[PDB]
A paper describes a structure:
The rhabdovirus matrix (M) protein is small (∼20–25 kDa) but plays a number of roles during the replication cycle of the virus. The M protein is an important structural component of rhabdovirus virions, forming a layer between the glycoprotein- (G-) containing outer membrane and the nucleocapsid core composed of the virus nucleoprotein (N), polymerase (L), phosphoprotein (P) and RNA genome. In addition to its structural roles, M has been implicated in controlling the balance between transcription and replication of the viral genome, in promoting budding, and in modulating host-cell transcription, -translation and -apoptosis. To further investigate the role of the N terminus and hydrophobic surface-exposed loop and to investigate the structural conservation of M across Rhabdoviridae, we solved the structures of full-length M from VSV serotype New Jersey (VSVNJ) and from the lyssavirus Lagos bat virus (LBV).
The structure of VSVNJ M was solved by SeMet single-wavelength anomalous dispersion phasing and refined to 1.83 Å resolution with residuals R/Rfree = 0.157/0.179. VSVNJ M forms a globular domain with a central α helix sandwiched on one side by an extensive 5-stranded β sheet and on the other by two α helices and a smaller two-stranded β sheet that is very similar to the thermolysin-resistant core of M (Mth) from VSV serotype Indiana (VSVInd), with 0.9 Å root-mean-squared displacement (rmsd) over 156 Cα atoms. Residues 121–128, disordered in the VSVInd Mth structure, are observed in the structure of VSVNJ M with residues 121–124 forming a short stretch of α helix (α2.5). The N-terminal 57 residues of VSVNJ M do not form part of this globular domain. While residues 1–40 and 53–57 are not well ordered and could not be modeled in electron density, residues 41–52 are located in strong electron density bound in a deep hydrophobic pocket formed by the loops between sheet β1 and helix α1, the region between helices α2 and α2.5 (including sheet β2), and the stretch of 3–10 helix immediately preceding helix α3. F46 is central to the interaction: the side chain of F46 sits deep in the hydrophobic pocket lined by the side chains of residues Y81, V84, L116, Y131, Y197 and the backbone between residues 114 and 116. Overall, these interactions bury 1050 Å2 of surface area. The interaction of the globular domain with the N-terminal peptide of an adjacent molecule in the crystal gives rise to non-covalently linked linear polymers of VSVNJ M monomers. In VSVNJ M this loop has shifted toward the interacting N-terminal residues: the Cα atom of K196 moves 9.5 Å from its position in VSVInd Mth and residues 195–200 form a stretch of 3–10 helix. Our structure reveals that the Rae-1 binding site on VSV M partially overlaps with the N-terminal self-association motif.
Author numbering: 41 to 52, 58 to 229
Write the structure that this text describes.
Amino acid sequence: LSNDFFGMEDMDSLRYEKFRFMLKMTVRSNKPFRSYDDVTAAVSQWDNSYIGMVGKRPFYKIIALIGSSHLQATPAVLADLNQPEYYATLTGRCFLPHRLGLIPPMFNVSETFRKPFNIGIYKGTLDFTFTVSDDESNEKVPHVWEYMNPKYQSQIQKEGLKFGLILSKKATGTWVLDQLSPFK
């Protein structure tokens, strides 16, 4: 029931970077996550080690955060309460406001990350496929934050820090990726 556990709804200077993305994210855990901050802790472990495209890493972190908010438990947890699995898929186009400087062009090639996670009470695996590329079309786009599940939109700044994202909203009108943490 959505009341006790996360993801059970289904069961029941400054630059703007314009990009498009696709994500497919699977999380497999030993026990069902009780809350969204348990989920983000697990998901955030995806790049504890990283050999993907250097220039894409910030965008991957961002869409991993966004995508996490959409994770939903599959029936795996009803077959076996001890084999919880969660899935999310999302595609979009948007602006990322950031202070990271010039971003080299990004091409339409996917990268897959398959990694363990261990956050104490919870442990398991992550299987993420991300695609991020420049969006050259003339269609108008939202800010990336508009793709966050509204249920969890209020938790953006705090949960972002788990991903190494230092986000602020001081007099800009929108969340800005001010910097990436050297510690994560």
